[PDB]
């Protein structure tokens, strides 16, 4: 970790390196509603770094060689199995939800570190402030239980208020039958095996909780599909947005420095996602944990620290 | 002191006002300056243990110099014995102890 | 009171049983007042009446332990005609432990107090016979 108090004293001031487009903009919508291309085009034509939706293998892609690892290393949770049978007795649904929240938290830490280190803004797809919607959809559809909901709320309470909220939240309003039609047109059969009640629960979670609680603390951009599927007018709105609220105004150099330390040391980022609350949906046990851990250390490029693995071409090991 | 930076470097940050017989502003000696001086020069070079036994005479002089416990007890008895004699009337105060004296410069 | 607990030992054991019982009862009562004060201060009662009731209970229990210990020690010394023998103090400590167990209404605490207080009183008697120093002044 090169950055630190000494680097801040020698001069790495975030407010010095900020500019007019140093914004966190999160695009959010339903399961299949114009979200991936919109964020990509916004980032492309405003010169920000685009971050797609943090999937199951996000940590695997951002660490090591970047190849997607085996699922037992990357969470032992399957979106396809959740779509096939959401009420399974192995606890796949809440395992997938918690793993996706951890991946989104890692992506938020990476985006915040990039913003506070380089000054370039970030365009996220469906950040950590819009994952309780999938929580409440699973809970209202009976897929998970109240203990899982309380555990997720506890992790969200421990990990949420240490970061800053996004500068702009863009929302795509697409109705449930249109989501049905787009999912049927996409062609993934597991994704066809979903319910309009589940999608309606997602949209209800949006409209009843996500939109106002970010409305009171950042700029909200609820747009229809026809206002969307045309990522230029939204860019003009983003350009002529005025940010006169939220906690980004009261931030200064040293608050940015401590936030940068927190987001650059990833162990403190994912510290409270590994709380020892022994929920049977998430807990593994000694034998399976040791087998998976030993296989992960015997995986190529993962036995030692990055830069010390001689099997992948690291050199001058004896001099460092 | 637990650590002796002041003794090693030769400075006296707080060693020069540790007691009454130390340096005083404008050469105004404190009370019992000579009695404390007799105690310090007695106890130097013999250690704390030998100071309590062999410098008892100088310390006992210094203690009731500063505290005057024996002075008050001696002076109280004179006032107590005089006041007892006034009830029986076999003593009278002199004029110079009754406020009618011949003053001198 | 230093003269009081010194006058505990001015007579050999098996003599002045009433005196030894009375001084031991006073010492146990003092220890009970200390323990009751600590208990009331750390764990306050619901009312001043409950607090003074707990102080009375603790003081009476500790005074009963001390009285039974001293009484049984002196009676054992008189019956067995040997004062300098720690088994008398062991019997007294067991009697104090059974008194504690009777006040707490549990035979397990009765036996536990018997063994521990008998061992402690036997060690006390051995130390007073052979000059053990509990709080020695530094000499080396």
């Amino acid at each position: 970790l090169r950055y630190g108090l000494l680097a801040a004293i020698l001069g790495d001031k975030t407010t010095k390196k900020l500019h007019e487009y140093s914004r966190v903009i999160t695009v959010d919508g339903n399961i299949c509603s114009g979200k991936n291309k919109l964020a990509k085009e916004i980032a492309q034509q405003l010169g920000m770094k685009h971050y797609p939706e943090a999937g199951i293998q996000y940590s695997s892609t951002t660490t090591g060689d970047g190849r997607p690892l085996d699922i037992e290393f990357s969470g032992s949770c399957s979106l396809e199995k959740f779509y096939d049978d959401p009420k399974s007795n192995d606890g796949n649904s809440y395992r997938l939800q918690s793993w996706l929240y951890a991946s989104r938290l890692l992506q938020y830490a990476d985006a915040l570190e990039h913003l506070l280190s380089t000054g370039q803004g970030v365009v996220l797809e469906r950040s950590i402030y819009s994952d309780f919607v999938f929580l409440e959809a699973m809970y209202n559809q009976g897929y998970i239980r109240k203990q899982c909901v309380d555990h997720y709320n506890e992790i969200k309470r421990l990990t949420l208020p240490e970061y800053l909220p996004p500068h702009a939240v863009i929302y795509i309003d697409v109705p449930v039958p249109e989501v049905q039609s787009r999912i049927q047109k996409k062609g993934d059969p597991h994704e066809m095996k979903v319910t309009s009640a589940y999608l309606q629960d997602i949209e209800n979670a949006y409209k009843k909780t996500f939109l106002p609680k970010m409305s009171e603390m950042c700029e909200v951009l609820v747009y229809d599909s026809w206002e969307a599927e045309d990522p230029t007018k939204v860019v003009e709105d983003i350009e002529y947005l005025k940010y006169n609220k939220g906690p980004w105004l009261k931030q200064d150099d040293w608050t940015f420095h401590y936030l940068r330390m927190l987001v650059q040391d990833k162990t403190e980022v994912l510290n409270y996602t590994t709380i020892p609350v022994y929920l049977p949906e998430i807990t593994i046990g000694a034998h399976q944990g040791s087998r998976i851990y030993n296989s992960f250390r015997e995986l190529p490029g993962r036995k030692y620290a990055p830069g010390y693995n001689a099997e992948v071409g690291d050199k001058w090991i004896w001099l460092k | 002191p637990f650590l002796d930076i002041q003794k090693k470097l030769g400075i006296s940050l707080d060693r020069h006002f540790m007691f009454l017989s130390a340096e005083q502003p404008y050469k105004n000696a404190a009370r019992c300056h000579a009695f404390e001086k007799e105690w310090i020069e007695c106890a130097h070079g013999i250690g704390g243990t030998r100071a309590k036994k062999e410098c008892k005479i100088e310390f006992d002089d210094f203690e009731e110099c500063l505290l005057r416990y024996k002075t008050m007890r001696r002076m109280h008895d004179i006032k107590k014995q005089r006041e007892k004699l006034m009830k029986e009337g076999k003593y009278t105060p002199p004029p110079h102890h009754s406020g009618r004296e011949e003053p001198r410069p | 009171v230093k003269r009081f607990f010194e006058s505990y030992h001015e007579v050999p054991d098996g003599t002045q049983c009433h005196r030894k019982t009375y001084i031991t009862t006073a010492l146990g009562g003092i220890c009970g007042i200390i323990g009751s004060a600590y208990s009331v201060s750390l764990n306050p009662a619901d009312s001043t009446l409950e607090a003074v009731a707990r102080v009375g209970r603790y003081t009476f229990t500790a005074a009963a332990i001390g009285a039974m210990f001293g009484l049984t020690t002196c009676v054992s010394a008189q019956v067995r005609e040997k004062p300098d023998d720690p088994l008398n103090y062991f019997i007294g400590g067991c009697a104090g432990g059974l008194t504690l167990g009777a006040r707490t209404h549990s035979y397990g605490t009765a036996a536990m107090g018997c063994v521990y207080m008998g061992t402690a009183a036997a060690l006390f008697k051995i130390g007073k016979l052979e000059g053990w120093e509990l709080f020695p002044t530094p000499k080396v």
């Binding site: - | - | 009171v1 230093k2 600590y38 201060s41 750390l42 764990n43 306050p44 397990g108 536990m112």
Partner: protein
């Protein structure tokens, strides 16, 4: 003897005594009013002990 009474006598009784003792010593209410009243009792007892030791 072995599965009942020696176990009831030495190890389990020692464990029970120390568990009861640690419960009684750490049954605290977390109130510094009580803590400072306890400190006052400690000060009073130390004054008494010094006065009787002389």
């Amino acid at each position: 003897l072995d599965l009942i009474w020696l176990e009831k006598t030495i190890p389990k009784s020692t464990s029970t005594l120390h568990t009861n003792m640690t419960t009684l010593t750490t049954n605290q209410k977390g109130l510094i009013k009580l803590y400072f009243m306890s400190f006052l009792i400690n000060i009073i007892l130390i004054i008494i002990l010094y006065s009787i030791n002389l």
